[PDB]
Amino acid sequence: IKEMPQPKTFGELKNLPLLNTDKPVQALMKIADELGEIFKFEAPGRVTRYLSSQRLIKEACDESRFDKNLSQALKFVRDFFGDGLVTSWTHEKNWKKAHNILLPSFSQQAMKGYHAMMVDIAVQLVQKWERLNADEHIEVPEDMTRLTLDTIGLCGFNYRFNSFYRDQPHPFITSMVRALDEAMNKLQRANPDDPAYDENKRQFQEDIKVMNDLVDKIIADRKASGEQSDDLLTHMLNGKDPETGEPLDDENIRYQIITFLIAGHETTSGLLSFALYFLVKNPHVLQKAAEEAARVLVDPVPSYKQVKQLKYVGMVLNEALRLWPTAPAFSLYAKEDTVLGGEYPLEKGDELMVLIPQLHRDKTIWGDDVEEFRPERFENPSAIPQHAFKPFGNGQRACIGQQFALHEATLVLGMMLKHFDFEDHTNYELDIKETLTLKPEGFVVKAKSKKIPLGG
Ligand code: HEM
Ligand SMILES: C[C@@H](c1ncncc1F)[C@](O)(Cn1cncn1)c1ccc(F)cc1F
């Protein structure tokens, strides 16, 4: 029954120039602040409706009426991730097949089995910071990415990236980032000329080969191994579908490996980085979290059971995900003609985009203090209405890695708070870099050891 707001248009380009910025999600949040709970965004040949209120998003999350959509971003990265779990349609046969095969790799029982290898990498992080000299500082997102990449490599695939042995990032992730940048930049401007893009397109082939060589090696080293593994790669290679009784095909396996290597570390690094940012900006909250870590983590290394008792650290992480969910949007399509919210008619196939940071600032849900960092909002999880808090997506297409991410992040943040005091020595000004995920660029701290020993 109502007509939808729309931001500024530019002739035949429609709204597209508004995203000529390196911070498009933050630009869309500002449009949502100006225009409200829903607005229409048009580009040449596509329309998207952006949702920001829990009132409308709770309906969008009704899986009888809306299914996951492959947004323009997911259609773009499908060039690399193929029909892996993140980039396949719900009704593409390999989605449910791979979901069925890999679900058991993300249970609590699987988490108990990953714990010792998560501790392996977390101890390496703590030892790096213990070994810094006087007046040296920490590049926070850089070291969080070292940890999370190593953790998914070791836990998932028994592969050691050995990121803490490197002063620059592992070539695999440099090659991935550079291949994606090149693929993006290429979508514009006189492409077959003298240099083209890659110094005549050679660097992309090299970067593609880096990624294919690593996938080759992860698979070959497993098959040649005379040790028993039971990890994510075991299920990828050998798990049979409970429905059809067949394993994943070889091509899809390659896509799942690169999907999980990337999905399994990037957003978790961003979460750890934002959580430490908010802690040093809210020293009362840091103190409360540090007291919990000291009281709970009484052993030289944490046990799985002790990580489960880091209740306040978990609330800290959820509140960082509330303010800056590091995968900040997900996309849905209308299965049939329908009316959203009693007021906005949709046609079959219409795209809805959930603007998660704005959902998480809905004052009718959280109160007027939405910009404050207050972990106590999560003291009682049953008090949060359904579909108010969605940093991991929705329904059967929600993040399969959610518990892995939160166990890793709770473990590591707990050990950080046990072993160091933290100083915001530069009075860092939050600068949020946007790729397909969010991170606090240039965030640096100093860590003063509490001199607490690590069986590390
Ligand atoms: C705090 C960290 C993380 C956040 C915020 C996050 C966020 C998300 C979101 C929002 C989705 C839904 C995407 C969509 O609807 O298009 C998703 C799906 C997915 N995530 Fe994550 N994720 C995190 C960590 C992880 C980890 C650690 C892994 C792997 C170990 C992972 C693997 C996946 C996969 C495979 C899917 C697709 C699930 C499916 O459709 O079957 N994510 N994640
Ligand atoms: C969105 C993000 C993600 N999704 C879900 N859980 C964690 C994440 F970290 C991402 O890593 C983004 N990304 C894309 N190319 C580089 N990075 C991603 C990973 C794999 C993928 F198949 C698609 C995809 F969008």
Author numbering: 2 to 457
What do the authors report?
Among the bacterial P450s, one of the best characterized enzymes is the Bacillus megaterium CYP102A1 (P450 BM3), which Armand Fulco’s group identified as a fatty acid hydroxylase that could catalyze the hydroxylation of saturated fatty acid substrates, primarily at the ω-1, ω-2, and ω-3 positions. P450 BM3 (BM3) is a natural fusion of a cytochrome P450 (N-terminal) to a FAD-, FMN- and NADP(H)-binding cytochrome P450 reductase (CPR). More recent work in our group has used the double mutant (DM) form of the flavocytochrome P450 BM3 enzyme (F87V/A82F), in which the first mutation expands available substrate binding space in the active site, while the second mutation is more distant from the heme but causes a structural readjustment in the P450 that alters its conformational state. We also report the first structures of the BM3 DM heme domain in complex with four different azole drugs, confirming the greater plasticity of this variant and its ability to structurally adapt to bind to several azole drug compounds.
Surprisingly, voriconazole coordinates the heme iron through a pyrimidine nitrogen from its 5-fluoropyrimidine ring. All other voriconazole-bound P450 crystal structures on the PDB show coordination of the P450 heme iron through a triazole nitrogen, and thus this is a unique binding mode for voriconazole. A novel DM heme iron ligation occurs for voriconazole, through a pyrimidine nitrogen on the voriconazole 5-fluoropyrimidine ring. One of the few direct polar interactions observed between the protein and one of the azole ligands is made between the triazole moiety of voriconazole and Glu267. In the case of voriconazole, it was clear the 2 R,3R-stereoisomer was bound, while for tioconazole the R-tioconazole was identified as the bound stereoisomer. Similarly, small mother liquor-derived compounds are present in the case of tioconazole (a molecule of 1,2-ethanediol) and voriconazole (a molecule of glycerol). The voriconazole, clotrimazole and tioconazole structures contain multiple monomers in the asymmetric unit, and in each case the general protein conformation corresponds to the “open”, substrate-free conformation of the enzyme, with little significant difference in protein or ligand conformation between monomers. For all the azole-bound structures reported in this study, the hetero-aromatic nitrogen ligand is oriented so as to fit within the groove of the I-helix formed between Ala264 and Glu267/Thr268.
